[PDB]
Amino acid sequence: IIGGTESKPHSRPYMAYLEIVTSNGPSKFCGGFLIRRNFVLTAAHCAGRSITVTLGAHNITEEEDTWQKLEVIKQFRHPKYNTSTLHHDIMLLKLKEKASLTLAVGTLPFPSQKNFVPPGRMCRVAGWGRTGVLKPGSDTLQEVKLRLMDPQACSHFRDFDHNLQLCVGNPRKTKSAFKGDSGGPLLCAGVAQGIVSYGRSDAKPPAVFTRISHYRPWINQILQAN
Numbered sequence: 001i002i003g004g005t006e007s008k009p010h011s012r013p014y015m016a017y018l019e020i021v022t023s024n025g026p027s028k029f030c031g032g033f034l035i036r037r038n039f040v041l042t043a044a045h046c047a048g049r050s051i052t053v054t055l056g057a058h059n060i061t062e063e064e065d066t067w068q069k070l071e072v073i074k075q076f077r078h079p080k081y082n083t084s085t086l087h088h089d090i091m092l093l094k095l096k097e098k099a100s101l102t103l104a105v106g107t108l109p110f111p112s113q114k115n116f117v118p119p120g121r122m123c124r125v126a127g128w129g130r131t132g133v134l135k136p137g138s139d140t141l142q143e144v145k146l147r148l149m150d151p152q153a154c155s156h157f158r159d160f161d162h163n164l165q166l167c168v169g170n171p172r173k174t175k176s177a178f179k180g181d182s183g184g185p186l187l188c189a190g191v192a193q194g195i196v197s198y199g200r201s202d203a204k205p206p207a208v209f210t211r212i213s214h215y216r217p218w219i220n221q222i223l224q225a226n
């Protein structure tokens with residue numbers, strides 16, 4: 001998160017920290033959020049050989065009683081996910097066991113309404129990602145408020161599409177989601193409407209988020225069968 005503030009500890013108890021293994025390099029990290037006691041929603045580009053999820057964290061370098069370090073048994077990547085265009089960048093992780101409910105850990109379910117969210121309003125995003133181009137991932141959970149932009153503002157991303165994706169962050173400001181914030185939720189008035197997907201290496205906003213409304217049938221289909 002660039003240009004944001006430190007979150008009040010444990011104020012977003014659905015937030016998930018992901019550590020992803022691949023066979024030929026060191027660990028990488030993403031965000032995510034718990035929508036059922038045994039399911040986390042994140043981005044498909046965060047997939048790997050194996051993944052561990054930490055719930056209940058604020059400072060990720062200091063172990064505490066609120067932590068729940070949970071095993072993932074299966075990864076469900078969207079079947080049409082495209083590694084070139086990055087269309088359909090969404091994934092569900094099934095946890096081996098259900099998480100415990102505490103003050104620091106709980107689910108964020110969707111409302112029944114599935115309406116399209118137009119440009120103009122302010123929303124909020126959170127994560128442990130880098131706080132600058134030459135800076136490291138934050139030790140504490142950070143957050144920032146950003147504007148939903150007209151789709152023309154993301155035209156330069158040649159594979160962007162308005163009906164699949166949100167365009168997030170005023171280009172006149174530095175505020176933005178960045179590397180390490182992948183898979184985290186964008187909340188508009190307390191409802192999750194987007195998922196951090198990608199942007200520019202130099203951090204100039206806006207960035208591109210998956211539009212959740214469009215994938216609601218697929219999400220329901222996975223959860224019902226599992």
Ligand SMILES: CCOC(=O)N(C)Cc1c(C(=O)O)n(Cc2cccc3ccccc23)c2ccc(F)cc12
Pocket residue numbers: 020022028029030045046047048177178179180181182196197198199200201203207
């Ligand atoms: C297990 C594999 O995991 C990885 O390979 N990971 C986690 C690296 C990775 C990241 C990241 O570091 O978070 N982002 C987001 C991203 C990248 C670049 C610029 C951005 C500006 C704004 C927001 C987000 C931006 C990706 C997008 C597509 C992609 F294929 C890979 C990545």
Ligand SMILES: [Zn+2]
Pocket residue numbers: 009010058064066
């Ligand atoms: Zn604590």
